[PDB]
Amino acid sequence: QPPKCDISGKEAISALSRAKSKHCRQEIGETYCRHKLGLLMPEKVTRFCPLEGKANKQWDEDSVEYMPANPVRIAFVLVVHGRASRQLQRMFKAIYHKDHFYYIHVDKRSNYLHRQVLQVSRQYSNVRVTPWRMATIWGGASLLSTYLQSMRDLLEMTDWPWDFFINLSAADYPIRTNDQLVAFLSRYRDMNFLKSHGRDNARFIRKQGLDRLFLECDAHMWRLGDRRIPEGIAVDGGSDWFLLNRRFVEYVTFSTDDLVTKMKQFYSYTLLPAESFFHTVLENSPHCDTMVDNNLRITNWNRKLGCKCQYKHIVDWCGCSPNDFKPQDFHRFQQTARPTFFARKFEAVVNQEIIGQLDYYLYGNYPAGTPGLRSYWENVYDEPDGIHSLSDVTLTLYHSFARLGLRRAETSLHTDGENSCRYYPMGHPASVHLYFLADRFQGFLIKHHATNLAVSKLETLETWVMPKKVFKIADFGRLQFSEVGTDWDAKERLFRNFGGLLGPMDEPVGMQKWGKGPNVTVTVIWVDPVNVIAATYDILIESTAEFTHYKPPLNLPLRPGVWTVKILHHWVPVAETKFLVAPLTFSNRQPIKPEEALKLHNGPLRNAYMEQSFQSLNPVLSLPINPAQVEQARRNAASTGTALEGWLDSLVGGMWTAMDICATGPTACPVMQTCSQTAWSSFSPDPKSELGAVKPDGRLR
Amino acid sequence: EEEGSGVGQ
Ligand code: NA
């Protein structure tokens, strides 16, 4: 239906055209028209602070050693998302104490992580989970709504007498012991710890978009136009990681004065609200004289890598994110310039070594013979979330990995009688894990059900599959590695699609890693499974470059099979690598039909991958096109059912290896080990991430 | 040098 007022703002028209839901277009128009009439935003606000400006109230590392007589009790608020439940359990182990409190909010989109957090809250009386769950997108207004609601919840928990409020994510980690944290805060229990930009405040406003009106809907932040900064108050901001004492949280929650009321309205339509809301309120409130310009955090900003506007599809704005710590950063945690107790970010799938160094440095080594200290397991599919949360690609390949494990069990037993290790697959995978060892990706772990055919009984197994090496070097050049994948993370310089799983409708990206040396120009060539040359281009490697990548515009679908990517230097071979474009056995999670398989597995719809042709280079690169295998690719493109499964399993076996397979419960295969007794299974002991009973000192670590 | 996460439009 038509809007309540003429909508002419260029920004609002752009958002109305991109929004999908009807509810979202309506809410956009309603917000715009309200602001047009001046009924949405405040224009002047009262300032209650007596000071004419800001206060900002000698760091001696030996002051955190005394024992408090009246130690503070802390309420930790954990805002978490993703799949890294074992890392979160490790950090929870490091910060836990029986006298503190823990209130955990799990992103609405992360049900696997939520089910794991629930098991934690059930074990301990001082651990609770938020019953409400928002989709806290990056920069979304909902993050402030999350904090403010948890503050109200926590203030109403009579049985939890807490003195400080600390917020942490699944990527934070302490850099000092709990004893020192309590000693420090017990000395300054009337202070509030927040860090400001300290530079030009007008530039801070513009780059944060504070003078712009935003609306959060459909998990997106829509920019709707301009707005005025309210008069009569000082606007400030910086980090959205802080420590606030109960006195001030009580004021922000229950105050009805002009300042708190109007600031809650203003910041309901603000981008990155938690980065300036608490600063602004504090500095203009009666508590202005309690502010310390230090958030007690070390944040690993590296704006040469972390500001690629990577959230352009989530928010109508460009921003930055902090980098992940590496082992060479350990010395930074030992600075004595200012007091610091936490740091971010840490990601175990990126680098776990620094996590282990930090945790042993704070609370010591685990006893000798402790297993799994250098390993990491991360669940990437859990049965309760349903096969429709997977894609046709991952569903196809996870199925193939399970069959590759069953064939290993059969061939592992050497006998001339009945083979008691022959299995028949049943149903869909029950879970999948990534598996790392010493910060090296080891492959996938698939748990699946199968019938042992000798005894005719159903068994639960887990298979470990590892990808075969495909990078090969052919004169000391600068090239160190080359790879093909999708979902390239520019900040961390790696593919988030860890397995390199690809289907016919994927758009692969080529990456090259280089070492130091003078600048050079090289040639890249893409070759399909029947020697069709899909693309060629030259790229300049500058003397300062370390990684290069590019995504060639390839017409879809890609011909299934094993592709090759070559790197030449003036026709001199340099290196090559391979990747798999797998045919799919599923369409909308159902077995693919012939008419569907035909259109998907027979190559590009335009008869070629690009407008420009490279048929001239086939004889030059010794890549002739065998007329026979071209036709056998047609025949393959028409197959379904058993024939298609044989084609797929043939390709997967050529690029992956079933390393081992174990049973979770009783088994009839005489040569299969119990998963709990292996070193690689997600069922094996992992004490660094396991949580048990509380010890006499009130600790878990 | 925690100067906020926003860059610009
Ligand atoms: Na509990």
8 Å CB contact between A103 and A128: yes
Q: Determine the Cα–Cα distance for residues A13 and B7; give it in Å rounded to an integer.
A: 24
Q: Which of B3, B7, B9 sits opposite A197 (nearest CB)?
A: B3
Consecutive H or E run containing A208: helix A201-208
Q: What is the distance between the alpha carbons of residues A21 and A2, in angstroms, rounded to a whole number? A: 16
Placement of tokens 């994927």 in the chain: A506
Q: From the CA of B1, how many Å to the nearest CA of chain A? A: 7
Question: How far, rounded to the nearest angstrom, does the alpha carbon of residue A145 sit from its chain's CA centroid?
Answer: 22
Residue A484 near residue A520 (C-beta atoms within 8 A): no
A124 Cα to the center of ligand 1, angstroms? 5
Angstrom distance (rounded) from CA A328 to CA A310: 26
CB contact under 8 A, B5 and A299: no
Q: How far is CA A56 from CA A139, A193, A204, A279, A551, in A?
A: 27, 10, 19, 12, 50
Q: How many CB pairs under 8 A join A and B?
A: 59
Q: Which residue matches tokens 């390239």?
A: A488
Q: Which residues of A touch B7 (CB under 8 A)?
A: 207, 307, 309, 317-320
Do the annotations mark residue A137 as ligand-binding? Answer: yes
Distance from CA of A402 to the nearest CA of B (A): 43
- From the list B4, B7, B9, the residue facing A197 with the nearest CB is B4
State the best of A194, A200, A207 to mutate against chain B, taking most chain B CBs within 10 Å. Answer: A207
CB A80 within 8 A of CB A53: no
Asked if B4 and A195 come within 8 Å (Cβ–Cβ), the reply is no
Contact B1, A298 (CB under 8 A): no
Q: B5 vs A320: CB contact, 8 Å cut-off?
A: yes
Q: Which chain B residue shows the shortest CA-CA distance from A240?
A: B4
Q: Would you say the C-alpha torsion A385, A490, A506, A139 has a positive or negative sign?
A: positive
* Closest-approach residue (CA) in chain B for A322: B5
C-alpha atoms less than 13 angstroms from C-alpha of A203 in its C-beta half-sphere = 7
User: Using CB atoms, which residue from A199, A207, A299 is nearest to B6?
Assistant: A207
Q: Is A299 on the interface with B (CB under 8 A)?
A: yes
Q: Do B5 and A317 lie within an 8 Å CB cutoff?
A: no
Give A139's contacts in chain B (Cβ within 8 Å): 5-6
Q: Which of A432, A431, A435, A326 is nearest to A376 (CA)?
A: A435
Tell me the structure's resolution in angstroms, rounded to a single decimal.
2.1
Q: Which amino acid type is present at position A629?
A: Q
CA distance B7 to chain A (A): 5
Residue with tokens 């690993």: A300
**Which H helix or E strand runs over A173?**
strand A172-174
CB A37 within 8 Å of CB A221: no
Phi-psi region of A223 (alpha: psi -120 to 50; beta: other; left: phi over 0): beta
Residue of A443, A440, A378, A454 whose CA lies nearest to A409: A454
- Closest residue to B6, CB basis, from A223, A239, A272: A272
Task: Supply angle C-alpha A616, A620, A622, rounded to 5.
Answer: 115
| Inter-chain touch B2–A207, beta carbons under 8 Å | no
- Full 3-state SS string of A306-322: CCCCCCCCCECCEECCC
Q: Please state, in angstroms and as integers, the Cα–Cα distance from residue A281 to each residue in A234, A247, A263, A278, A660, following that order.
A: 9, 14, 7, 5, 59
How do beta strands A488-489 and A494-495 pair? Answer: antiparallel
Distance CA A11, CA A3 (A): 16
**Is there a binding annotation on residue A138?**
yes
Residue A572, beta-bridge partner list: A569
Nearest to A334 by CA among A353, A355, A350, A358: A358
**d(Cα A317, Cα B9) in Å, to the nearest integer?**
5
Contacts of A551 (CB under 8 A, 6+ apart): A507, A508, A509, A510
A566 pairs with which residues across the strands? A525, A576
Helix residue ranges per DSSP H, A300-427: 353-363, 392-412
Euclidean distance between CA atoms A391 and A8, whole angstroms = 40
Nearest to A318 among B2, B4, B9 (CB): B9
Tokens of A457: 């009984």
Cβ neighbors of A654 (< 8 A, separation 6 or more) are A468, A562
Binding residue per annotation — A240? Answer: yes
The residue type of A140 is G
Q: How many CA atoms lie within 13 A of A619 on its CB side?
A: 1
Neighbours of A657 (CB within 10 A): 15
Record: contact B2-A239, CB cut-off 8 A: yes
User: A520 CA distance to ligand 1 centroid (A)?
Assistant: 60
Beta strand extents in A182-319 (DSSP E only): 192-194, 212-217, 220-226, 243-245, 291-293, 297-299, 318-319
- Helix or strand holding residue A512 (H, E): strand A509-514
Q: Which amino acid is at A279?
A: H
Let me know: does A393 contact A560? Beta carbons within 8 Å: no
Technique that determined the structure? X-ray
Collect contacts of A674-680 with beta carbons under 8 A, ≥24 apart.
A675/A462, A679/A371, A679/A372, A679/A375, A680/A375, A680/A435, A680/A437, A680/A442, A680/A445, A680/A464
Secondary element (H or E) of residue A435: strand A423-437
Cis-peptide, bond into residue A557, ω within 30° of zero: yes
Task: Let me know: does B2 contact A203? Beta carbons within 8 Å.
Answer: no
State both tokens at A548: 């290069």
Q: How far is A45 from chain B (nearest CA, A)?
A: 24
> DSSP strand E in A196-275: where?
212-217, 220-226, 243-245
H or E stretch at A67: none
Asked if A575 and A522 touch (Cβ cutoff 8 Å), the reply is: no
Q: Cβ separation of B1 and A301 shorter than 8 Å? A: yes
CA proximity to A97, closest of A180, A191, A192: A180
Do A324 and B8 touch, CB atoms closer than 8 A? no
Residues of B in contact with A240 (CB under 8 A): 5
Amino acid A433 reads: H
What is A347-365 written as a DSSP string?
A: -TTT--HHHHHHHHHHH-P
Q: What are phi and psi of A515, to 5 degrees?
A: -105, 180
Cα A146 from Cα B4, distance rounded (Å): 19
CA distance A203 to chain B (A): 10
Residues 1-9 of B with CB under 8 A from A: 1-9
Residues A48/A137, Cβ–Cβ less than 8 Å: no
Is B7 within 8 Å of A295 when comparing Cβ atoms?
no
> Which residues, other chains included, contact A251 with Cβ-Cβ below 8 Å and sequence gap of 6+?
A260, A285, A286, A287
Encoded tokens for A431: 């879970």
The single-letter DSSP state of residue A101 is E
Q: Cα separation of A430 and A272, whole Å?
A: 38
Domain ranges of chain A: 61-363, 373-685
B5/A275 CB distance under 8 A: yes
A348 in Cβ contact with A68 (< 8 Å): no
* Residue A624 CB-density burial (10 A; 0-12 exposed, 13-18 middle, 19+ buried): exposed
Report the candidate in A212, A222, A319, A315 with the shortest Cα–Cα distance to residue A266. A212
The answer as to CATH 3.90.550 being correct for domain A61-363 is yes
Of the candidates A586, A609, A394, A353, which has an alpha carbon nearest to the alpha carbon of residue A487? A394
Which residues have a C–N gap over 2.5 Å right after them in chain A? 57, 474
| The dihedral formed by the CA atoms of A212, A283, A149 and A104, expressed in degrees to the nearest 10 | 100
**CB neighbours (10 Å) of residue A539?**
16
Distance from CA of B8 to the nearest CA of A (A): 5
